[PDB]
Amino acid sequence: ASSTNLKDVLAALIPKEQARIKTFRQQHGGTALGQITVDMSYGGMRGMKGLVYETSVLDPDEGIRFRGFSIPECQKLLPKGGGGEPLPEGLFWLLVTGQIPTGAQVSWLSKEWAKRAALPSHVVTMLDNFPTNLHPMSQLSAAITALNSESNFARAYAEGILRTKYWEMVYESAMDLIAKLPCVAAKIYRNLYRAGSSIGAIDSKLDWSHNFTNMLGYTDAQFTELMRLYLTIHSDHEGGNVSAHTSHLVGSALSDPYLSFAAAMNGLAGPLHGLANQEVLGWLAQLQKAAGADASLRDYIWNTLNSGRVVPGYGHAVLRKTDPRYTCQREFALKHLPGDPMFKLVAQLYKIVPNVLLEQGAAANPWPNVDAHSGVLLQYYGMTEMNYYTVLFGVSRALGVLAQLIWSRALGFPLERPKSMSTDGLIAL
Amino acid sequence: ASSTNLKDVLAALIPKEQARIKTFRQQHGGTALGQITVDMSYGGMRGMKGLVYETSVLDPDEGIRFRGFSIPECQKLLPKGGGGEPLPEGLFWLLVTGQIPTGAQVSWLSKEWAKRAALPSHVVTMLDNFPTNLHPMSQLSAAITALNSESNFARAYAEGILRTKYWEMVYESAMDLIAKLPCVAAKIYRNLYRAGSSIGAIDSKLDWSHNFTNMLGYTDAQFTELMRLYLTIHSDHEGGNVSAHTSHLVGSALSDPYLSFAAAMNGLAGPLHGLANQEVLGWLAQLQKAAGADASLRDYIWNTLNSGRVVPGYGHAVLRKTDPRYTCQREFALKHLPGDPMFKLVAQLYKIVPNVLLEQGAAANPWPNVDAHSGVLLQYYGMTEMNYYTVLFGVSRALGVLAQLIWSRALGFPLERPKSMSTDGLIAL
Ligand SMILES: CC(C)(COP(=O)(O)OP(=O)(O)OC[C@H]1O[C@@H](n2cnc3c(N)ncnc32)[C@H](O)[C@@H]1OP(=O)(O)O)[C@@H](O)C(=O)NCCC(=O)NCCSCC(=O)O
Ligand SMILES: CC(C)(COP(=O)(O)OP(=O)(O)OC[C@H]1O[C@@H](n2cnc3c(N)ncnc32)[C@H](O)[C@@H]1OP(=O)(O)O)[C@@H](O)C(=O)NCCC(=O)NCCSCC(=O)O
Numbered sequence A, B: 001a002s003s004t005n006l007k008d009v010l011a012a013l014i015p016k017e018q019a020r021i022k023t024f025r026q027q028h029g030g031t032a033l034g035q036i037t038v039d040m041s042y043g044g045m046r047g048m049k050g051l052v053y054e055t056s057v058l059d060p061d062e063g064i065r066f067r068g069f070s071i072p073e074c075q076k077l078l079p080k081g082g083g084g085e086p087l088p089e090g091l092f093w094l095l096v097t098g099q100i101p102t103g104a105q106v107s108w109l110s111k112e113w114a115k116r117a118a119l120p121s122h123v124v125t126m127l128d129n130f131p132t133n134l135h136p137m138s139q140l141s142a143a144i145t146a147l148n149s150e151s152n153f154a155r156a157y158a159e160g161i162l163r164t165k166y167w168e169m170v171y172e173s174a175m176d177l178i179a180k181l182p183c184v185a186a187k188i189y190r191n192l193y194r195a196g197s198s199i200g201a202i203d204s205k206l207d208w209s210h211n212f213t214n215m216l217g218y219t220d221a222q223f224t225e226l227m228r229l230y231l232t233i234h235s236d237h238e239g240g241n242v243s244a245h246t247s248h249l250v251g252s253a254l255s256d257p258y259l260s261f262a263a264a265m266n267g268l269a270g271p272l273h274g275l276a277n278q279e280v281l282g283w284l285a286q287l288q289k290a291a292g293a294d295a296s297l298r299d300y301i302w303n304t305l306n307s308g309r310v311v312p313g314y315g316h317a318v319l320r321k322t323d324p325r326y327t328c329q330r331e332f333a334l335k336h337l338p339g340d341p342m343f344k345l346v347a348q349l350y351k352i353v354p355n356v357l358l359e360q361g362a363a364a365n366p367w368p369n370v371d372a373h374s375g376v377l378l379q380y381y382g383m384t385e386m387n388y389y390t391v392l393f394g395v396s397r398a399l400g401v402l403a404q405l406i407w408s409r410a411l412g413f414p415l416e417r418p419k420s421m422s423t424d425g426l427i428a429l
Helices: A006-028 A038-042 A071-077 A088-097 A103-116 A121-129 A136-150 A152-159 A163-193 A208-216 A221-233 A242-252 A257-268 A276-289 A294-306 A324-336 A341-360 A371-380 A386-410 A423-428 B006-028 B038-042 B071-077 B088-097 B103-116 B121-129 B136-150 B152-159 B163-193 B208-216 B221-233 B242-252 B257-268 B276-289 B294-306 B324-336 B341-360 B371-380 B386-410 B423-428
Strands: A032-037 A049-052 A057-059 A063-065 A419-421 B032-037 B049-052 B057-059 B063-065 B419-421
Touching: A006 A088, A006 A103, A006 A163, A006 A386, A006 B038, A006 B423, A032 A038, A038 B006, A038 B049, A049 B038, A063 A324, A071 A324, A088 A103, A088 A208, A088 A221, A088 A386, A103 A163, A103 A208, A121 A136, A121 A163, A121 B121, A136 A163, A136 A257, A136 A386, A136 B136, A136 B257, A152 A163, A163 A208, A163 A257, A163 A386, A208 A221, A221 A324, A221 A371, A221 A386, A242 A257, A242 A386, A242 B242, A242 B257, A257 A386, A257 B136, A257 B242, A257 B257, A276 A294, A276 A341, A276 A371, A276 A386, A294 A341, A324 A371, A341 A371, A371 A386, A419 A423, A423 B006, B006 B088, B006 B103, B006 B163, B006 B386, B032 B038, B063 B324, B071 B324, B088 B103, B088 B208, B088 B221, B088 B386, B103 B163, B103 B208, B121 B136, B121 B163, B136 B163, B136 B257, B136 B386, B152 B163, B163 B208, B163 B257, B163 B386, B208 B221, B221 B324, B221 B371, B221 B386, B242 B257, B242 B386, B257 B386, B276 B294, B276 B341, B276 B371, B276 B386, B294 B341, B324 B371, B341 B371, B371 B386, B419 B423
Parallel strands: A049 B419, A419 B049
Antiparallel strands: A032 B032, A057 A063, B057 B063
16 A cells, blocks of 8 residues: 655665664674874874765765766666756655655655745744845855754654654654755845845745746746756765765754754855855956966966965865766756856866866866856856855755765764864874 | 064964974874774764864863863963952963963953954844744854854955965954854843843953853852853863864864854754753753652663663763863852752762663763753852753853864864765775
8 A cells, every 4th residue: 555755765774774784883893994194183084984974975086976876877867857957856865765766756755845845934034134245155054043943853852752763853854954945045045136026935846946946036947957957966975075074963963953954054155165166156257357368377377376275166175086076067068058158268277277286286186076167057047146156055965964864863873073182192192 | 562462472383383293294194093993983983083183182081181281270270350260261361372371361361352242233133033932052053153244264265365374364253253252142141031131231341251141140249250160161172072073174164263163053052962051950850840869869860761862961972980070060069059959969960870870881981071060050040041051051162162273274274074985885895
């Protein structure tokens, strides 16, 4: 008997994994997987194997994998709206469960995320009173903190449920959070950029991406496809990235999913992280102000470097090759917006930047990362408010970090609490 | 010539340290300081040496040290208001600089934190419109996120300063943040618990703790001393604790100090972390509802355990002995509130809990941590709104995490970005 329910599948999956990780540890817990050096410690844990994070794994050379699925594999395997790009809904199923969903599974996520998307009056209030000089990432993160009022996990805990059931309330709060996100994000958009307008209603019959582009106010049918692609690829990027790691750290202490996502956002907002989104456009925007020569392009790049700034959109803590997400995005431009002058500048930069970065001899990875290519896409469709881009990253990111959050608590991962040391201390060691 | 300025001292200190860490690494960067096992990875980095954090170091047996100063040493060495307890101001100097401040230094922090304490209208607004069912930690964290509008670092970055000067703007934003904190915290207090009342003005002539207790509305002169003690001891606790680590992680991405503190708060709000403050009181509050026997006390403790809950206030990820902060607090009660029945219950619990926890055989550290003893102190003075306690922890914590934040950027610590791995991946390794 019966029909679709991710929670029921999860209920079947949790014990098996539990069992699976216990024996493995029973035989291998003592196994040394690596060493820790002084340089690693002073270096941002660079190179340290520190966390278990199941939904995605990043390879230095190949780039990110969703099961063990690459982006190109996803592109082909996840269901589409009708009509070429993968639905983030499907990606979500995949991350959570390990399996590729059927269209029908996927339609369930949509309907479910539509049913859940409702914003409480205190939140609508705050967002409406916020200043327009308050950064959109800020506005977003405060709003999601303010939603914790509603946490099902926070309430359950308060009531004293048994640890074992944590994963269950975490999942409710995760599905609700994901549902609400686009409404908060769009209300911010509308407030800042479309004063006096309203985000409108969620239509249970559309997919999450499309409802989002509706609330944003975009009509272009290719924009909708860009959206689906965007939110899918930005999903997850293994556990060690700042945003994911922050949510993992905060969530380990038993802060509900709302609070942990919000702190995640404060991390995504950093220039070295997701704000790169925005930094790239601004830097292009300056570049153009000051159709240029490779040589003038090269002078420009030098002057950034010489000034103690970074060139945004290039480099990566783990990747050592061009980000497939970058490729992914290039391939979308080549199809749809090949004559775009901003596009052409980004294509041209790919020719120079790496070379300049190899010349300088500092960046361990001179190739571009996702952020170098994403804004150019948005701008083309009319979405030119750059300080807003990171919000969109914020939205996607929720898919991966929440999908994992549920597993963490399901597997009972404890408090993340490493040892620190001071220089004096280490000097002495 | 001239008078006091922490920034000038810092300017003198930064290069030397820089130099000091470079050579050390030049000779020892390759040195293996430790190994990483599977259990560590599945275990919350328990036992992993992962971060350099200079302001404080925690010893498993002795407990926390500010330089290399213990709490008892601080108690004696830091200047006092007139009149027995150390001024958090002094502690702050100590953390930042490595040295014990003179009274006169310390008076400068006070005057400085008084000059800086000013809240922008958008923030006052939001706090005033917040619901009373929105948790105080939530209210706090949203407010500090909303303050990022004002970040001096966020602005400088935007302007493109050279990396080298980051520490300078981080310090301004840190001193401003610390200054404002008590105003935000008190406005929350006043709103939730003292409706219609106003926090009043900051008096440049008092010390930070006293202005705070004024804005809170407390008059008792011993309360003021409790406050000074509270905010000092809760200062810092090395780098690996959830809140500190979160700020370190977020700040590494170049999110301004406001954003990084806020996420820190989302971490402090977790039940396994600072919310323990509050959890302890509530659990005592239940206990009393349901002058009892050790045996009835023991039954109660069992029933929590048997129900898959934790006994709050006991256990620690690193300490292996009674927290000196706990002692510190006990010694304050014994002096001032020795007949308090809540006090007596906490004294009695110390007799039983550990034993029950040893009996159960799960907690690696059966002794109590700071949180087991702090609320009992507050309640005695009339501050009985338990859901508020963690705010106070939030306030103190700012001293340590901001003092370090400044050093991180000063020493140029890069993006924190470790590698993760999935179970499948590890299984394969
Ligand atoms: C992403 C990164 C933080 C990785 O940092 P890392 O692992 O510490 O880099 P690395 O190991 O190559 O660093 C070696 C040196 O090269 C420098 N370097 C690396 N990338 C860059 C860059 N794009 N521009 C200029 N210098 C750079 C790096 O700052 C360091 O200089 P120093 O020794 O004085 O501190 C860095 O490449 C960078 O700052 N990139 C620019 C910001 C950016 O595009 N971020 C997005 C990354 S991925 C997508 C996202 O997260 O949103
Ligand atoms: C603070 C702790 C999270 C440390 O966690 P840990 O390093 O993973 O503890 P551990 O190594 O002793 O854990 C071994 C087992 O004992 C359990 N245990 C440890 N402390 C407790 C406790 N107070 N009550 C019951 N069981 C406990 C722990 O949950 C684990 O059970 P399981 O194997 O099923 O997951 C834990 O002691 C605990 O949950 N304490 C209660 C919450 C609390 O008081 N937190 C404040 C800590 S310090 C001040 C602050 O941060 O605000």
